[PDB]
């Protein structure tokens, strides 16, 4: 797929509040995974056989701490980032005086206004490179080229990331024709509750 | 509402004809008495119906071929077009079994361009190409020398003359028109008075002012350019043509007994005419209008009064009073209206469209253009022969009456396809015909189905005239018409309709 | 209005299977759409016909039927014998073309030329209820052993040979073969364009002042009053509206021995000559309510600029100040009030219909004399088509190389009478704000344009616009006991909104009872 | 609280089907949990080995005069040799030494992948779309070529795609609404100002449409594996793994293109009122919302192209042409007629028919467990959105919050 998204909104309020965030996305694209007759790894076989037929809680944690609680069975890959920066409205009123003032640097500046320049950057994906000379660029108040934009995108299809998924658990995985696949699957069932029981803030 | 739809009406079916002794068939069938309009109902598309019989007696249509006949397509080819190197034939019936091929032409040679166009027959009164009349293939030999520029062409058997007859001329005109008119006017009035004198002091005054300026602008531009550009002459021989075997299978099933319907079919299917010269060339019209007026308007009036009077003897008394009052109105109007019409006929997609566009064109678009009409050419004048003038014995059985039957056809299909019998568009909108249901064909700046929509607070309505009246007896039979179907004066109407507003004829 | 609530799509109950055909095997079944989702909604999760596999319990011949002329075996497909070894495959088993040791039976060389390109979508057949193409209707490529040949005007394009030093042009694209189900196709290189601009605008200003001062003395009063007003109004308007059609070729199909396509053919051979509503409507649905007679190729340009503004402001002050002595005294009363308002709304319409997606893309964007003509030339390899006439799908039956089908086509007008009922967008619900109604397979949509928000289109953006109304559809018609049936309808779906224009259709049907 | 999701307890085994050597389970979600409480991540089926009790049932049959390939599809005996690989498999012509009687008669051909991804899968849940069930590399043996259209280029057209029409359209509609107002006037008084402003453009490009054939068409090996493979029974987990891996429907026709659209969106306002009653009212508001959308094209010309959407500047239409022509390269499914998965299931085949109604009774299924009618009420009228089995809700109100408890 090519799919890209970008969202600009600042919102203040009085009677007051004042919120700014900017969201892009670059969807590469779309996987799903056969539900039927997987064809798993060797070495997650002998993993398998590596597990005993009663409930050894330490090895199946072993187990579900080397594979995974849950794999992704359907996913968008891709890029994204998310940029926030909110203002002190009274002073964003007279060290700037209104928000054309810096639109015009995206869509010539004053040296006190920096609130609005200092944004928190959040960047998901990506060879590296690029999203750092954004960032170079953006933490001197600098919205980034259209160049840079571009470069970083297709960086993107070097080093993607997965934007969303449907994860289901690994004991679906579970070969129906394993030796006692069955209680081994209930086995893995129990030690992802024990894993979620354990390891959690209610702890 | 304004409009509503009228749905296509057709007539009763006809009486049935008698059984056709060979094609064993009789007919039926029904006039269109009104064409839907507005998304009326369409009429059935079966104003045509028709029924089997049994042979109730022979014909005499087996019309003797001398020639060789085309065994899948009957067309009779005299034998020296046999083993001619060419299909001669439909279906190379002409070529098959010869022992020994006698090409004539060894040359490369091209078909002249879009002269397979002028084969097909128009329907003259839509000025419409139909299906193929004429065939444009058959060259009973030929091979000829003919050339244009380096090339080498093959003329057809039915062509008389195509021959670069190439001439050019073109129509520039403008006018553009300019006036404007200012007119100021102030007035000033003051008046004072005084006196002075136990003392006593009186005062009076006055002030009026009254201002007036008025302006208007008037600006006025017609554009109109035409290039007309011939590049071939095309003349089709007057005699002992070859049919197209679509038009020669379809005059064949004509009922000998008249039966309107089918001869319609035929025209319907191949048109009324057929084309027996033409000049081929290029068209571009261009036609820009535009009126752009301004007004503004001011008045302005001012009034002062005073009166002011102080009386002493200390002690004093005293009445004094002053008004102002001031008013200003003020209007601008301003409006521009503009159309332009753009209007091309033969060339290529790439300089239709780059002419089509709004601006004048480079001369080298124009030469570009007129390049590329040499081969792919319209028609800019015509000549035509009616159709059943290729009804000819050397073809069909009963060719005379097959002949007389499409002249009357021919009278009834120019009644019925008139498009006087649409009711009339709004906003000038030309009413067409178009099958079975009629479209208003509305100018640019009116809009919908029946130019119900525009802006502009008036437009000139042209006239349109009525259906023609139906034959007076002898004695002068005679026609009348009304210019009822739009009467011009509507909306500043535009021209009347031209004559003859009644026509009259021998019996 | 808020939006309306959602509504579950309903389907009824399955039809009683159709006794198994026995050429084909298989039982039919159909539903009744009983409710499309108007809004939100849960889909229905069925179709609404069905089909199962079958055994008949007795033979059918049919394979032999025709075989005075030559029927293929995958195909109904009944040939003239001389299409047989013709040299070009008329059915697609190859039946007639295959041991053809007789090659003497070839009819001519003709495939040096193509089949005329995008002849297929003229092919098509056509619904009326939805505006797309169905199934093939008319056999795009069987050309009955003719060899009718088009000149393609446009065939001269550049080429270069460095081996020498010319500049010139080829000729492959000289001639298309045209096939059969043509009884003309024609290249004609045809423009036109309109425009209309236009421009009003008034600014009307009105001030007027009045102060009136009076004094007297006796002690002493002295006052002054003043009222004031200020109006101004501005209205701007600018229309423009471009049209240009280019017109490429013009084609008519034949209106008498259509062959129909083989997939059309088969499916017609497997309808019951008794009325199976389910049978008949499965046919309309594959091969649409229409079929097309007549064409115009070529590409469409429109454009459409409106723009309106307003302004209105006012200002009013009305005073009074007064002073007097006897010790000296000062006062002063009043008010004033000022309004300002202003508006405006600009909405643009760009739409090409033509070659590339790239300059029809460039030309929707930016009018120019660049992509003009570059659009013209992508109009020379893919022109679309521009006009065409259509006739309701039966009226191919009368026509056919099958003879009559007098049942079949009563029959099929009969299904398609209902279809057209029982399909129509009037089952989408009211689409507000001069949404468009669409219904696809089991379930609707609105489509709304930008001003217009919402499931149903309900919640423009601004605070509303003039709205013109639409039909419910019809009603059932009535249980008539006279001579006469009577079906009613109104314009309520929505109703004529903001001052927006009543729909124009009648409100009254009538039939023979 | 939130809640943490809840699920039934699992259905009863069924009995083991034979040839399949399985038994199986189910369990609805009976809540998808809201409000940060857990995901249902747990599986909706379960199944089991079972040494099967009874004979089964073959899934072969002799075709009989029909060629039988080694992937199991049968295929009339002209596409022997054809060359065509009309099995997928070449089993059609890997046998034949000479003859290879291939079509298209040594003229230039070329493959479509437009044609030979048409007819996509479709989940109705999100309308994502997925691999088509459709061969469209079987060609029947015909030729069928058609010219790409925006390029001089002749392919043959695959025997599933009744036709492929590259009618190409292009739009831009674009509106700009843009309102001011100043009032200074019970005993009530104001100073109430706006300044609102709507734009809106978007612009589709449609490159072509499929249609799907309607009838005998050849589907791929393993779809139609997967419907051996499918239980008889009727148990719901099973046939979810079916939608899940097909989709519920396939496009039985598509519009292919790309899309761009923008959206801005201000409201910046204030009030104040003051006055009697027979008042102290003062508020202000700043709204300010951006959205650009690209869909289709090549990456390298569909963000540059969305970039200068969101910059002012003036569009290079040269740009545009880049990005419209790529969309060539990479269209998009921009619009689809869907119909039933089942609707594929071939009829004569084993069962065919029960299949096909248990399908329809899994798409019910479906539809209805993952749909949010089973989930709990927003607070302030916010939309209620089943994410990913969670539910969580979002207010176009100037409430906020995941339940929109407070604004």
């Not at chain 2, 302005?300 to 009073?321: E, I, M, P, Q, W």
């Not at chain 2, 159309?339 to 570009?368: C, N």
């Not at chain 3, 997939?263 to 008794?274: F, K, R, V, Y």
């Not at chain 3, 919640?459 to 009603?475: L, Y």
């Amino acid at each position: 797929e090519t799919k890209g998204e970008k969202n600009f909104r600042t919102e203040h309020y009085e009677e007051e509040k004042m919120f700014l965030h900017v969201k892009g996305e670059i969807h590469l694209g779309r996987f799903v995974m056969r539900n039927r007759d997987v064809v798993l790894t060797t070495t997650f076989v002998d993993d398998i056989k590596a597990l005993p037929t009663t409930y050894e809680k330490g090895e199946y944690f072993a187990f579900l701490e080397t594979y995974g609680t849950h794999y992704s069975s359907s996913g968008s890959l891709g890029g994204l980032y998310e940029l926030i920066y909110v203002l002190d409205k009274a002073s964003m009123k007279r060290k700037g005086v209104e928000l054309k003032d810096i639109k015009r640097c995206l869509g010539v500046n004053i040296t006190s206004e920096n609130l609005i320049d200092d944004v928190v950057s959040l960047i998901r994906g990506g060879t590296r490179k690029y999203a750092f000379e954004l960032k170079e660029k953006l933490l001197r108040g600098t919205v980034i080229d259209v160049t840079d934009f571009v470069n970083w995108a297709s960086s993107i299809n070097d080093a993607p990331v997965l934007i969303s998924q449907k994860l289901s658990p690994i004991y679906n995985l579970v070969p129906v024709k394993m030796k006692n696949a069955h209680l081994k699957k209930q086995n893995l069932e129990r030690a992802i509750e024990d894993y979620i029981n354990e390891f959690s803030v209610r702890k | 509402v304004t409009l509503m739809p009228i749905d296509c009406e057709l007539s009763s079916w006809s009486s049935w004809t008698t059984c056709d002794p060979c094609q064993k068939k009789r007919y039926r069938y029904a006039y269109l008495l009104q064409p839907s309009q507005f998304h009326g109902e369409p009429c059935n598309f079966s104003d045509k119906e028709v029924e089997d019989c049994v042979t109730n007696r022979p014909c005499r249509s087996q019309v003797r071929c001398e020639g060789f006949v085309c065994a899948q397509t009957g067309r009779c080819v005299n034998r020296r077009l046999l083993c001619n190197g060419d299909n001669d034939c439909g279906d190379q019936s002409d070529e098959a079994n010869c022992r020994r091929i006698y090409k004539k032409c060894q040359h490369e040679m091209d078909q002249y361009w879009g002269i397979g166009s002028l084969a097909s027959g128009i329907n003259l009164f839509t000025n419409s190409f139909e299906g193929p009349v004429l065939d444009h293939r058959y060259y009973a030999g030929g091979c000829s020398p003919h050339y244009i520029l380096n090339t080498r062409f093959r003329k057809p058997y039915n062509v008389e003359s195509y021959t670069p007859q190439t001439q050019g001329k073109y129509e520039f005109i403008l006018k553009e028109y300019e006036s404007y008119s200012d007119f100021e006017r102030n007035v000033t009035e003051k008046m004072a008075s005084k006196s002075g004198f136990i003392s006593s002091q009186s005062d009076r005054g006055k002030h009026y002012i009254r201002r007036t300026k008025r302006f208007s602008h008037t600006k006025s531009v017609f554009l109109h350019a035409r290039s007309d550009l011939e590049v071939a002459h095309y003349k089709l021989k007057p005699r002992s043509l070859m049919l197209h075997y679509e038009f020669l299978q379809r005059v064949k099933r004509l009922p000998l007994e008249y039966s309107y319907g089918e001869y319609r079919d035929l025209f319907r299917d191949f048109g009324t005419h057929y084309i027996t010269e033409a000049v081929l060339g290029g068209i571009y019209e261009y036609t820009l209008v535009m009126n752009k007026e301004a007004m503004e308007r001011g008045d302005y009036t001012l009034n002062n009064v005073h009166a002011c009077a102080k009386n002493d003897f200390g002690v004093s008394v005293g009445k004094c009073r002053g008004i102002l009052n001031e008013i200003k109105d003020r209007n601008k109007r301003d409006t521009m209206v503009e159309d332009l019409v753009v209007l091309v006929r033969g060339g290529a997609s790439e300089h239709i469209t780059t002419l089509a566009y709004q601006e004048l064109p480079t001369a080298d678009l124009m030469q570009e253009w007129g390049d590329a009409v040499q081969y792919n050419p319209a028609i800019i004048k015509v000549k035509v022969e009616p159709l059943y003038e290729l009804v000819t014995a050397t073809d069909f059985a009963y060719s005379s009456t097959v002949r007389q039957n499409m002249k009357q056809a021919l009278e009834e299909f120019q009644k019925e396809v008139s498009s006087c019998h649409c009711a009339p568009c709004q906003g000038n909108g030309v009413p067409v015909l178009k099958g079975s249901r009629c479209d208003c064909i509305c100018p640019v700046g009116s809009q919908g189905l029946a130019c119900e929509v525009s802006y502009r607070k008036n437009t000139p309505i042209d006239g349109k005239w009525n259906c023609w009246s139906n034959w007076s007896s002898c004695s002068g039979r005679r026609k009348t018409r009304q210019r009822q179907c739009n009467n011009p004066p509507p909306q500043n109407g535009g021209s009347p309709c031209s004559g003859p507003a009644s026509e009259t004829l021998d019996c | 209005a808020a939006t309306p609530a959602a509504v579950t799509c309903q389907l009824s109950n399955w039809s009683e299977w159709t006794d198994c055909f026995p050429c084909q095997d298989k039982k039919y079944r159909h539903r009744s759409l009983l409710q499309p989702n108007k809004f939100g909604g849960t889909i229905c999760s069925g179709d609404i016909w069905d089909q199962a596999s079958c055994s008949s319990s007795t033979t059918c011949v049919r394979q032999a039927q025709c075989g005075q002329d030559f029927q293929c075996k995958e195909t109904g497909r009944c040939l003239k014998r001389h299409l047989v070894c013709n040299g070009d495959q008329d059915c697609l088993d190859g039946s007639d073309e295959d041991d053809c040791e007789d090659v003497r039976a070839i009819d001519e060389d003709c495939s040096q030329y193509e089949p005329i390109p995008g002849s297929q979508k003229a092919a098509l057949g056509y619904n009326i209820l939805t505006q797309e193409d169905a199934q093939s209707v008319y056999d795009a490529s069987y050309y009955g052993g003719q060899c009718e040949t088009v000149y393609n005007g446009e065939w001269r394009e550049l080429r270069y040979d460095s081996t020498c030093e010319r500049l010139y042009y080829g000729d492959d694209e000289k001639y298309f073969r045209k096939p059969y189900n043509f009884l003309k196709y024609h290249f004609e290189a045809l423009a036109d364009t309109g425009i209309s601009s236009e421009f009003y605008d008034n600014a009307n200003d009105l001030l007027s002042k009045v102060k009136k001062d009076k004094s007297d003395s006796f002690h002493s009063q002295d006052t002054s009053f003043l009222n004031e007003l200020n109006k101004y109004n501005e209205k701007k308007f600018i229309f423009t509206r471009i049209f240009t059609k280019v017109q490429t070729a013009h084609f008519k199909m034949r209106k008498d021995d259509i062959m129909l396509d083989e997939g059309m053919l088969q499916s017609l051979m497997e309808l019951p000559d008794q009325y199976n509503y389910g049978m008949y409507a499965k046919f309309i649905n594959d091969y649409g309510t229409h079929y097309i007679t007549s064409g115009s190729m070529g590409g469409i340009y429109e454009y459409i600029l409106v723009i309106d503004k307003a302004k209105m402001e006012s200002l009013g002050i009305t005073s009074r100040d007064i002073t007097t002595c006897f010790h000296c005294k000062k006062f002063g009363g009043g008010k004033t009030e000022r309004a300002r308002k202003a508006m405006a709304v600009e909405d643009i319409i760009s739409r090409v219909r033509g070659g590339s997606s790239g300059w029809s893309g460039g030309l929707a964007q930016n009018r120019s004399t660049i992509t003009y003509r570059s659009w013209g030339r992508s109009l020379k390899y893919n022109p679309v088509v521009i006009d065409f006439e259509m006739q309701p799908i039966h009226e191919v039956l009368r026509h056919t190389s099958l003879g009559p089908l007098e049942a079949k086509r009563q029959n099929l007008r009969r299904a398609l009478d209902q279809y057209l009922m029982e399909f129509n967008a009037c089952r989408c619900g009211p689409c507000f704000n001069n949404g468009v109604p669409i219904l696809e397979g089991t379930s609707c949509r609105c489509q709304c344009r930008l001003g217009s928000l919402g499931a149903a289109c309900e919640q423009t953006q601004t605070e509303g616009a003039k709205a013109d109304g639409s039909w419910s559809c019809w009603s059932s018609w009535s249980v008539c006991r006279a001579g006469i049936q009577e079906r009613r309808r109104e314009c309520d779906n929505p109703a004529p909104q903001n001052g927006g224009a009543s729909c124009p259709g009648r409100k009254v049907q009538t039939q023979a009872c | 609280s939130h809640i943490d999701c809840r699920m039934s307890p699992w259905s009863e085994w069924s009995q083991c089907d034979p040839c399949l050597r399985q038994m199986f389970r189910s369990r609805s979600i009976e809540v998808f949990g809201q409000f940060n409480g857990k995901r249902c991540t747990d599986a909706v089926g379960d199944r089991r080995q079972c040494v099967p009790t009874e004979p089964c049932e073959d899934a072969e049959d002799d075709c009989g005069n029909d060629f039988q390939c080694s992937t199991g599809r049968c295929i009339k005996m002209r596409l022997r040799c054809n060359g065509d690989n009309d099995c997928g498999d070449f089993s059609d012509e890997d046998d034949c030494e000479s003859e290879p009687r291939p079509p298209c008669r040594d003229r230039v051909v070329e493959e479509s992948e437009l044609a030979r991804t048409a007819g996509y899968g479709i989940n109705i849940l999100g309308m994502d779309p997925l691999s088509t069930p459709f061969d469209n590399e079987f060609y029947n043996g015909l030729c069928n070529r058609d010219r790409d259209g925006n390029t001089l280029t002749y392919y043959r057209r695959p025997w599933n795609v009744a036709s492929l029409i590259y009618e190409t359209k292009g739009e831009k509609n674009f509106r700009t609404e843009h309102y001011e107002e100043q009032i200074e006037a019970l005993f009530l008084s104001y100073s109430s100002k706006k300044e609102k402003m709507f734009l809106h453009v978007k612009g589709e490009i449609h490159l072509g449409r499929f249609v799907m054939r309607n009838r005998d068409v050849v589907l791929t090996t393993t779809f139609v594996d997967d419907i051996k493979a499918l239980p008889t029974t009727y148990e719901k987990g099973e046939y979810f793994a079916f939608l899940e891996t097909y989709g519920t429907h396939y496009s039985s026709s598509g519009s292919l293109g790309g899309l761009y659209e923008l959206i801005y969106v201000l409201d910046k306002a204030s009030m104040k009122r003051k006055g009697v009653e027979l008042v102290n009212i003062t508020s202000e508001n700043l709204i300010d919302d951006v959205v650009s959308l690209i869909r289709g094209g090549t990456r390298k010309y569909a963000f540059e192209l969305k970039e200068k959407l969101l910059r002012g500047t003036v569009i290079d239409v040269t740009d545009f042409v880049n990005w419209a022509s790529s969309i060539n390269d990479a269209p998009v499914l921009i619009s689809q007629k869907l119909s039933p998965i089942y609707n594929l299931v071939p009829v004569k085949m084993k069962n065919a028919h029960l299949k096909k109604q248990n399908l329809e009774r899994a798409i019910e299924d479906y539809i209805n467990e993952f749909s949010v009618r089973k989930c709990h009420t927003c607070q302030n009228g916010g939309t209620v959105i089943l994410m990913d089995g969670k539910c969580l809700c979002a207010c176009p109100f100037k409430f906020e919050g995941i339940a929109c408890e407070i604004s």
